[PDB]
Amino acid sequence: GKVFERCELARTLKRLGMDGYRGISLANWMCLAKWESGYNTRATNYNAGDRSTDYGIFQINSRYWCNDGKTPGAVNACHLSCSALLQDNIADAVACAKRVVRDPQGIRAWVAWRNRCQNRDVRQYVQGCGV
Numbered sequence: 001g002k003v004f005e006r007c008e009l010a011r012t013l014k015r016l017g018m019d020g021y022r023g024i025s026l027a028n029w030m031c032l033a034k035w036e037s038g039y040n041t042r043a044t045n046y047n048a049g050d051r052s053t054d055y056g057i058f059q060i061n062s063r064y065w066c067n068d069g070k071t072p073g074a075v076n077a078c079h080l081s082c083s084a085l086l087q088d089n090i091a092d093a094v095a096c097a098k099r100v101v102r103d104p105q106g107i108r109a110w111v112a113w114r115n116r117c118q119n120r121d122v123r124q125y126v127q128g129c130g131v
Helices: 006-015 026-032 091-102 111-116
Strands: 044-047 052-055
Touching (some): 006 026
């Protein structure tokens, strides 16, 4: 797919109801989506340890969320192919991201968030977007 521009994405995420979903602010979703993919919807990351792979803009993991047909002991939570998470339309990626935080860990499941966003101010990511 395509790569999102910061405000291009804040508008899209706001539109899809990401502002305050399960408490997460648009800004933490934006911090998440940068340090996980650079807004690259087509982003992919392989995990040699468990053979899983993180897909799309919010790097949804293949081991428990979507099925990519090659992950050991894969659970298919969102009950969808991981390919769907690599489209220009992120509706599908947003829904698994929403799902992921519906669990106990919430936003903290993503290692990149805990390292770059957690315990920091993230208002920058949205400053200037007008949302």
